[PDB]
Amino acid sequence: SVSKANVPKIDVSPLFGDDQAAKMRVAQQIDAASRDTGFFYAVNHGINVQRLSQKTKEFHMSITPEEKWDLAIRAYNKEHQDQVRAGYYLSIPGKKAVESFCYLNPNFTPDHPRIQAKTPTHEVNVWPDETKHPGFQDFAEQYYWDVFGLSSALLKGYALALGKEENFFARHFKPDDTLASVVLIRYPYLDPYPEAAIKTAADGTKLSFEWHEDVSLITVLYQSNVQNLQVETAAGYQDIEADDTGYLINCGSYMAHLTNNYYKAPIHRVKWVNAERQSLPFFVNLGYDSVIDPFDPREPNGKSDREPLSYGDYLQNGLVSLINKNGQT
């Protein structure tokens, strides 16, 4: 059996204030965790995650099959050709257990210039009827902005950790244009649990989602208190303990590109567990045209042999590749 991964709990509350020394001591902890397993829990983050979990459970448990087709992304409903990212991702009973609802920046409205131009990766969110889900759309849009504020503070900590000014990433992470997404994922309890919805790793571990790196700058994740994640380290796959009070943070592959793999995007996977639970990631994406020049914090001159890559190019190519590698969610 499997060793516990080192995933420290880091009090991120100084990243919201003006005590610069204290912010540097948090940045050192972020640097250490990014160089070790690649994961940490952010604690003292200020978000009401119990209420997030309760509002998400009331949505998942009350939405009906009719509403799921009406919200479905194009992979499930050919009539919704504009919904590639945002909307409902249906389960397939007997075959695929997980189901989810994704939404994007609430400022992507019909009049937004990138929506008018039909720019890839930008979509107008879709929502269930307000009378059937009272308060849900308002709650979820407010949650987007709560977790955007936490993510901006975390990006200040990452910037300081890499030897940069605290706005080095945050200046590209803006309310009018971020490509960040929230996904409200339901993993169900099922009796019996269909074998077709269970994958098997080469080491024999039963999985709900195979190994991958995230397509993100960073990922800011709330999960229920049911252990399920594992991280590949030099000593093999190790279990990430659950903590339903903190946010689990890790880097995505855009951070690995920008830092020339100094902060790796850690490879991780989701064990199969027959439990009713929630996985609620926020993928911190930049704007479509955002380009950060790659650098290397292990080299004296900081220079890297990597080409600049716009975030829009990164994101479009990565979302397709992850579907190809690990299946349509």
Ligand SMILES: CSC[C@@H](NC(=O)[C@H](CCS)NC(=O)CCC[C@H](N)C(=O)O)C(=O)O
């Ligand atoms: C420990 S993986 C986190 C979560 N999985 C996901 O959120 C999955 C696997 C990627 S990490 N998300 C995805 O990558 C699917 C689409 C990305 C998103 N819909 C978007 O367009 O921004 C899960 O299975 O618990």
Ligand SMILES: [Fe+3]
């Ligand atoms: Fe992931």
